[PDB]
Amino acid sequence: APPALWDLAADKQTLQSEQPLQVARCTKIINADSEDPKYIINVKQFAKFVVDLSDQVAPTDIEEGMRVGVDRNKYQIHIPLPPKIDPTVTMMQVEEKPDVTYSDVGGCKEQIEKLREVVETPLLHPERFVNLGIEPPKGVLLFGPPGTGKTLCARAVANRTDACFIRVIGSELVQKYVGEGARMVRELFEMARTKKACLIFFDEIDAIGGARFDDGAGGDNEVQRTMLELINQLDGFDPRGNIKVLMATNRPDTLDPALMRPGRLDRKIEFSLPDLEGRTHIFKIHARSMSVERDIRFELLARLCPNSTGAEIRSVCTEAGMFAIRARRKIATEKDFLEAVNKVIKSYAKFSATPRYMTYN
């Protein structure tokens, strides 16, 4: 109540400041310039007004398509407004705060390194690459088995140095009432250019990357608009775009995006996925949880589950203590859980072996 007391007691100065600028309605888009003093302007009220500007605003600062404030009485220009587009879809597109630091890697070395130098090093030491340039690459492509999809990006989140970057979900591009995706894909680009080097990442491009053509009926027409408008706006020359790129999906399909990327993109890497000697690394990260007996050998257990990525062995460490709670054991003995680990790999492979290799093959 005290904060609301002082909060409501500022209305006496607020009402004195309420006289000016409260007639600033509304926001209006300009059209053309006939001369220096006089400009034609349109407003959402549907009435297009040709009017002059206030003497407190330099006329050279107003460019075609700039929204400005208006004093409805005189209709003259009051103050320009930088923000224009878009409603809540943008704020949903924005993400903030870090998580999943680099210590969460599962042993991948050359992978994580080669993708570190494409994104983090150019913005960490810009003068270095500009000096020795050449020129940094445009971006990368991620795909393959599920372990570990999409978490590698979380690494860039926690390793982001200063300015936060934006993540984007794929399926929201395609929408009912065709023609909404056109505005969608366009606006975020301008936003990014104002965002000075901020990163834009699309997940599951295979949803909007349906290629190419079928007999009838479309069908892919509303899809092809989304992807092709994407590539066309990606192939513009101004800047373009300094915001770099980041891409991830599941299967390498389809051919149209895959044939369009190597001109504009580079550095396609494939998982990898745990190597034999690398499988133990996931066990080293999960070893900090619960309590590891000094006699437990990770390398012995690791070979018994090939192609499990990190998820399944996470459930191995999980079912250890899970079945230990049911048996009241405080620590999980190596021989105790493995009897349930051969069962937890086989029983879940019985109905399905999870053949992601078959998904794209």
Partner: protein, 341 residues
């Protein structure tokens, strides 16, 4: 005191209810109200400006389009579908034969939240939910485990793919709001039963297509995977046929636990008849041995329906005790039902 008699003169008497479009660091907020109108509002009172965020409803005082107070009003279409409640009288103790099946899921749903002391000290944390299924048409018997869960915490049940694909989408966004609303009600349980998204044949009304259906399901996986949300909104999936769903769905969830529903044996069926006929009154000559011997591959609701039709037929004679001749003659009706076509 005096502030209540002051600020009221500024907003009233008439005022409009608009929507927030975007906020400027100059404390001028751009509001949008019916129809297609904009403005600069700067007020230092009742805000709460940081918690508002664009895309929410704000008041408009006639002079001039000022926002005196914040309004969060629900209602809302989706918020209506989660409640209430049930808190059903049924319990997990009214079912039998799945003790070996139920032990792990009952543990898994009471693993977090209640009984946290052995969970939090062990540092396991498998909060991806559970996945259910079974034959031939069960999954409601697995729902008979959801009733016990409805007795604890918060519950929400969203079933059937018709709610997305009946019309054009906008795809998952209907599910995307279920995630966040369950986050505002966290902890809560979200149960999904019988997922036909890949098993459906004909879409409802006019919508397309088979592959767009898949893409809304895939975005459901990334929502569920997920990057990046730690909230629960515990999710449970269930269906009749797991073979239809793609293996692409299993790694994000449920990677730890999935259960299979076995067919009941003679001992189980005996238990089932016991539990249903507990409240019912039967004649002395009714025996539980011959009944389960004559039946082959029947679930709890089948032996339930035969008793319901036995009592319905006994209503024709207005008798509360069902005789064995009436019971067998009634049993022959559902027996002839499944055997007619």
């Amino acid at each position: 005191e005096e502030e209540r008699s002051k600020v009221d003169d500024l907003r009233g008497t008439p005022m409009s209810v608009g929507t927030l479009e975007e906020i400027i660091d100059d404390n001028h907020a751009i509001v949008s109200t019916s129809v297609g109108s904009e403005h600069y509002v700067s007020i230092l009172s009742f805000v709460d400006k940081d918690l508002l965020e664009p895309g929410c409803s704000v008041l408009l005082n006639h002079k001039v389009h000022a926002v005196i107070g914040v309004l969060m009003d629900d209602t809302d279409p989706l918020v209506t579908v989660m409640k209430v409640e049930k808190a059903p009288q049924e319990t997990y103790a009214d079912i039998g034969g799945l003790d070996n099946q139920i032990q792990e899921i009952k543990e898994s749903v009471e693993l977090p939240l209640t009984h946290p002391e052995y969970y939090e000290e062990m540092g396991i944390k498998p909060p991806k939910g559970v996945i259910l299924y079974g034959p031939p048409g069960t999954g409601k018997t697995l729902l008979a485990k959801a009733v016990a869960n409805q007795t604890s915490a918060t519950f929400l049940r969203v079933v059937g793919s018709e709610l997305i694909q009946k019309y054009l989408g906008d795809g998952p966004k209907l599910v995307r709001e279920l995630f966040r609303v369950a986050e505002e009600h966290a902890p809560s349980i979200v149960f999904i039963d019988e997922i036909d998204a890949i098993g459906t044949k004909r879409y409802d009304s006019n919508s397309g297509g088979e592959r767009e259906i898949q893409r809304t399901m895939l975005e459901l996986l990334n929502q569920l995977d997920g990057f990046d949300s730690r909230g629960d909104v515990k999710v449970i999936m269930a269906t009749n046929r797991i073979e239809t769903l793609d293996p692409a769905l299993i790694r994000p969830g449920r990677i730890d636990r999935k259960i299979e529903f076995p067919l009941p044996d003679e001992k189980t069926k005996k238990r089932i008849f016991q539990i249903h006929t507990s409240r019912m009154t039967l004649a002395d000559d009714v025996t539980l041995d011959d009944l389960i011997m004559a039946k082959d591959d029947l679930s709890g609701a089948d032996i339930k329906a035969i008793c319901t039709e036995a009592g319905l037929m006994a209503l024709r004679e207005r008798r509360m005790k069902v005789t064995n001749e009436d019971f067998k003659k009634s049993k022959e009706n559902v027996l002839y039902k499944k055997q007619e076509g």
